[PDB]
Amino acid sequence: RARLYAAFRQVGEDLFAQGLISATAGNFSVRTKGGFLITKSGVQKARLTPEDLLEVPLEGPIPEGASVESVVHREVYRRTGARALVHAHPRVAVALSFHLSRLRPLDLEGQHYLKEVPVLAPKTVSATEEAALSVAEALREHRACLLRGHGAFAVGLKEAPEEALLEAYGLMTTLEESAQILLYHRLWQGAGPA
Template identity: 35%
Template sequence: MSSLPSFTDDTRGLRLEIIETARALPKLGLTKGTSGNVSARVEGGFLITPSGTPYEDLTPDKIVPLDLEGRCRGDFLPSSEWRMHLDFYLAKPDCGAVVHCHSPRATALACLRRGIPAFHYMVALAGGDRIECADYASFGTRALSEAMIAALGERNACLLANHGQIAGGPNLKKALSVAEGVEDLADQYLSALSIGDPHILDATEMKNILQKFKSYGKQAGELTAGQTAAFELPVRVD
């Protein structure tokens, strides 16, 4: 069995970043009270916010370390949703951080058990041509974690039926940004549904969009061989 991840001073900066990310959730309107949780990968495991602790009361020593076998150490219990975070990391080796929240509009869609189709090309932010809604299971259970993995597929975000949403990314900043994006898309989709049936982009266009997203945000010198810019570049005159 692997040894438990250490909780040494070299993780202090990451623990502080986890706290900052958790405190950003209510400020951004992504959750209320103590709902939601945040984690970040470390060597051999991950660090996660504790169970039932108000975000304003978080301190670095309250952030709980777990290994990839679900074992923890310290005086605080991890979030009740630790298993979702664990399985997210096991399924996606490139994932460095996970944010789970009960953002209101994404949760509203999740309570309808509806995912977010390609009504807008920005659904590609989750890494696919739609954002799925996982089947319902009680919070904090292995069944919920399994439902999440099935809904994620190759993507990095999904809705959780009658619950909320979960999003991952290479780091905490990106995971939080994806969670924000999912909530924005849910808001736009619900607004469109209130008027009529939104037009859904077809699979060919979404395949094109996903290809563009691979280079979106990169500068010309950062494009690798075979990559093209996400959109037509102007003629450069030096």
């Protein structure tokens, strides 16, 4: 438990530090024996405490106080073999999500780890079964996905929960980095010839 809480605390701290989340935006979880452990709603992710996490069953009503995206996390664990999930709001990737149907990284790291990131535009993108189903089906075949104008989800598959969470965290940072590289590459080209 101590180490696992540490992984959550670390991911929250690093996501905030890199500008992938701020304030209360974003949420993350890991698959547990009973279901999944997720961050509570409205808490400061960059400064998490053990009491800021709650276990949610894959079946039944969602405990009050859980992240509003719990319905989405639950569906992903139900339909995929995900071991951890990170939801964040990569700014550049989100901006690019209005312009692309899929994000294809130009860089090696992104091509290797993400391959291609689909951009989903369901009527509702947050805290709905609609959003949940769309995200869950996309992550059945992709490690990450973008919700147009909202944010992104990244999946961890490693056996150890702490490692799966750090894995999902890494994919999320790789996504924003790939989005930034795509933007810089395009702006440089657009500013030429020169």
